[model samples]
Target chain A: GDDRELAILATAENLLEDRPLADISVDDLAKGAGISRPTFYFYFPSKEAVLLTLLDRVVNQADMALQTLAENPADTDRENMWRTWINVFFETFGSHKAVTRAGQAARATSVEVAELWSTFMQKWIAYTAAVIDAERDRGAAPRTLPAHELATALNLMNERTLFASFAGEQPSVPEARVLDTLVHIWVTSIYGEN
Target chain B: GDDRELAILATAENLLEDRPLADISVDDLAKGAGISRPTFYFYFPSKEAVLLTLLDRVVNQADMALQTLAENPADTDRENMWRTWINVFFETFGSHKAVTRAGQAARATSVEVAELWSTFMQKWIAYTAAVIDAERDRGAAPRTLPAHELATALNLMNERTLFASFAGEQPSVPEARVLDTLVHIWVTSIYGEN
Candidate 1:
């Protein structure tokens, strides 16, 4: 059942890569997965649930990777550390751009998916706040605003910017330029230098 | 006809303030406007079209204000000028947060709203790119990336960030902090300073 569920999610994700989530029907998804509509329902209530499942997996992977960076702080070269963090973050989104895009599109209308994305974001915010708190304790980061608030803003910036960049037709900007600008903001905000 | 159209749009916008766009039906919009559903269709084909009309007006207002800033070069104190521009931008969004949120929410599923939102964003990108180009020409801004690309990224960051902030419960962060952080990024990205 788990393998079949994974197969359904992969098929739905692949379909989303070429078309918008709204355009892909449950029948199309089930057919793509070589399963009956009833079986698809048995595994997932709707196409969005499949997307939510995929997003959960990717976000978990991203969270774990971010934890590694948090635990192994590269304080010696903070600039490079921020750069690597942005790279990893963007790479995670890049790898699952289709599912991410679909999830965002669905987030507007689907309560389940919206809550799932929000929960993932809240976790990310807490993780980021912890990192900022740790730096502030060392007298390395600014304390003008609360760590959680600062983390929330930066994380929102990253999420919004990356979602738009990856989901659009021509992309708002080049991937490298976007990464560079984001890293610059994160580094400067924390260290007061770019 | 124009008066009744305005009445319907106003009603839709007002309703949107209290709830997400998806939760509102054409019947509700017509009833709120004191018109029949068919009469509502006479003015706009769908509920999303009503939102599109509202968004177009606000985007135009924002564009006109931004044009004023663009035409009058603020060479001496770019920081204040940027600050003012952001204030104006955010104010426009604040005034029409409901419609804007609905438009964003609907953009995913409705082709018309999606195109409308994209066109508006492109115009904003062009407006911001022109500002960056002017600043770069004055030798006040960096030339590391194309003005258009840099502008696109910033505009996207603003749109996405503001959308999430205004659309969320209790906001992801304080309004002032969100504004401050956004303005900081815009200033630094263009002026290379905090």
Candidate 2:
């Protein structure tokens, strides 16, 4: 990418702090980056395309961290591993605050971005299903709900809770309470006695 | 309401079936209702307010059914009551299919409807919390997570799943599996062994 392209991306993050992505025009981005409107078009098709680039970057970073977090040093307990995985899950996803909000903005504005997000979610839910199935097979988790069925519900719960928290909507789920509350539900729902 | 107002509201619902609320214009609504655009304004401040009226009607209907479903026979089992309540929940919410979808459309399009929906949610969550607290007191359900915390998570799960199902999103939460899936989580999350 050109230096101008990097500058446009940086200005978007800064501009997003002042107003929504919808309010930030391509001319503002080009002028902020000391480039022409034509130059901006040369780099990205539209402002939403710029945001899609940023979203992909942030998601890739978080995915790599989550994969590393999933690896135990040596035979960690199931409960502890689950706790740490969730901890890193929130930590990485929440780290890029502006970009996270930008992705949401792009999601509503860009069909391409929305479909890409759904793909990411389906993969995440499948990973969760695999974990549920393995634990059930090991007799560590109960045979209560089917693995994928339970996995999708729990994941949708997380997605809703996390977005509510991240979006800073009032009457929001308590950020302080969420991690422990989620851990409790996942453990008790799957591993508890009939 | 005036004849024109009622016609406007009915037309809005029919327009929503063809396109989203955002796509339907006041002009189109007026033309569809056989009124001039100025007369359309006299009836509804905007198209969204019309949908808000429709949403309120649907919600009130569901709310009444939910209230009746909560009341139990003299000696109903705790698990049976929960299952019935959930069954009634899906049944009523699913009955007015287009209006339910319109509520979702209006929710995103109107700030007034969004907050009204949130208020409805808090009231519903409070009711769920009351049920959880009472169940715990009777020793019919264990105290696993805090009553409101568990209630909020589970209710949000329902909200997300219902919207996904109603919106016809593929890879959706299974309509066939949802009732049993939800009943299992609610029963096991709060009522089962630690």
Candidate 3:
């Protein structure tokens, strides 16, 4: 049953392929999906609502991945946390690369989309902060920097690196390469000479 | 003569305080300066070129600060580079915060402005990498990761924090607080287990 709804959502995304989202109408999506406009309205109240549906899918995956990292043994250690988290993050968010890209562009001009993204990032930050604190508790990390500030930098990096790699500005390097960079920075800034 | 030129530039910046550079016209600026449009054109070819004058001022300061750090005692040690580099960078950039903020807003829509920002970052990375390599030669820091990645991450944090501060979205922490957080992230991530 959910597959059928997702199939409709997929059809709506394909219809957005060539045309600007601003130019696409609910009627267009309905016609493209071989449904009535009223049916389209039943599924999504507006264009923004439909777009949120797509973004929600991504947020769901990211939330689940971060939850897993927080609970997994391998991700418990400070050294292992960044790599495990990012690898899961990349794989999860990377799967919906094109959709995410378009969603970001559309978001620039839409308040609703911006709110959705902010909500996702805020929730994401809380999840990341938990793991960061865990490592800090284990003495694998220094307690110099406040947990909140550290969490935000990690969140910003995830967003930046994800978009950067997707745009081909920075190739996705080995998990170790990026994770090492994060851990090294985390340790030195917080602990000084330790 | 330079005083008059500088006066005109200062007046232009004051006008920009009331409106974005994209929204402000040469006529308004010339009128504000008590000059005609042709006279304004004689001084600066385009709106962007006028902005470039401000950019040059910031760039000159950044270059001098980077040069000073390049020759500092800490520059000889990779582990100390992040602390020294971030301190000087935040202080230097904070002084020119207004103009840099304008340029950042322009960057999302202007290719020339983005390229200009990229060029400045390239200078930062190349110069810092040289320092990291020098420290490696002195046997102070292990060359486990390439200097470029560290430099890139450092730069990335600077851009994010500065922009977040300028946008007024990061209210929980001041700009200085954000910079300090970044410095911590940078040093620890680069020199793991050191």
Candidate 4:
């Protein structure tokens, strides 16, 4: 049972190394993982199910990291805190960009995947909103936007950053610089300048 | 020559009606337009070129309209300005969602098209930044969050709205609700509830 799960997971990773999950096939997964077509289903009901498992793992990891970051705010200044927090995300995504991209593209394939992604995104948005709310309350951040607006901005910034990286034209700026730019914008827009 | 250009445009639109631009071929265009394959090339260098031509037209139209909007600041109510601006955009895209989606998807197909889209996006961002600056200067908007930050927020809102609409979801709330919600948030965050 465990072997099949491992095989499927490994096959998913290998398939993603080639193309989006929407394009992957059962035969492709089975062949890639050295499993028979029938046996591939022992661990996962379907290829989409396998994707669900993979994304759930990623979502959990991100959630846990964000929760930890929230509960244990950095001793450094707000800038440093943001730098450290976003760096964790950058690190997590950089290693599995292909896998993540596949998961994203696959959301368009089925309602199940789409719903899962929406739920996942909403949770991420909620977490980001909470963090932004905390920052605003502490007077360390700008108050120019509501929680959802701030969350949406951060989320969009993230999507743009990752999409750029995936397309191989990411800016040469470090994560810290990007974080600083976001914070600078926030402070100015919310507080009406320094 | 004008007739030929019209023929090619008609052919492309027909193809779009049947399939995505990426999946269409120059041969298909030639056959549909009643031209030889080489003749199709005479009108448009390639399928990519054809798509670019269409996109360039779309951007030019929107840009011209926005430029006119930008030229005059006599009516400087921020909320009214954004509503009217967004309404024009909605009207443009609502009637031609397919064309806009095709253009966006086709833009990702080639380096040149991608660059063109990015260039247009940068201009949109710049215009938004100018408006934000004016609002902040007038003490009507947050002077704290930089114009770019506000621009980023507006862009995200547009993106989220567009994508949801593309997926056949309604992201736009009722007019009264959206205005009330947006104004409340904006006033609280920027003008400090005054």
Highest-scoring model, lDDT: 1
Extract clashing residue pairs from model 1: none
**What's the C-alpha lDDT at position A36 in model 4?**
91
Question: Alpha-carbon error at B1 in model 4, in Å?
Answer: 1.5
Model 3 lDDT per residue over B10-112, tens place: 8777876656686778787777777778888888888787787887777778778778766766635444557677767666666766676677666545567
Tens digit of per-residue lDDT, candidate 1, span A136-186:
888887675577776777777788778777875433665657877777667
Candidate 1 Cα deviation (angstroms), residue B135: 3.4
The better-scoring model by TM-score among 1 and 3 is 1
How big is the positional error of residue B182 in model 4, measured in Å on the Cα after superposition? 6.7
Total clashing pairs for each candidate: 0, 0, 14, 13
Instruction: Give per-residue lDDT, candidate 2, residue B174.
Output: 72
What DockQ, between 0 and 1, does each candidate earn? Answer: 0.44, 0.56, 0.29, 0.13
Candidate 2's residue-wise lDDT over A72-175, tens digit each?
Answer: 44367776666676776578667766777667545544678778777777777788889988888898887878878887777777767666677665445687
Between candidates 1 and 4, name the one with more favorable TM-score: 1
**DockQ measured for candidate 3:** 0.29
- Interface RMSD (Å), every candidate: 3.5, 2.2, 3.9, 7.2
Q: TM-score: which candidate is best? A: 2
Model 4 chain A scores worst on lDDT over the 10 consecutive residues at A169-178
lDDT per residue for candidate 4 within A55-77, as digits (tens), equals 77776676687778878878986
Q: Which window of 10 residues has the lowest lDDT sum in candidate 1 chain A?
A: A185-194
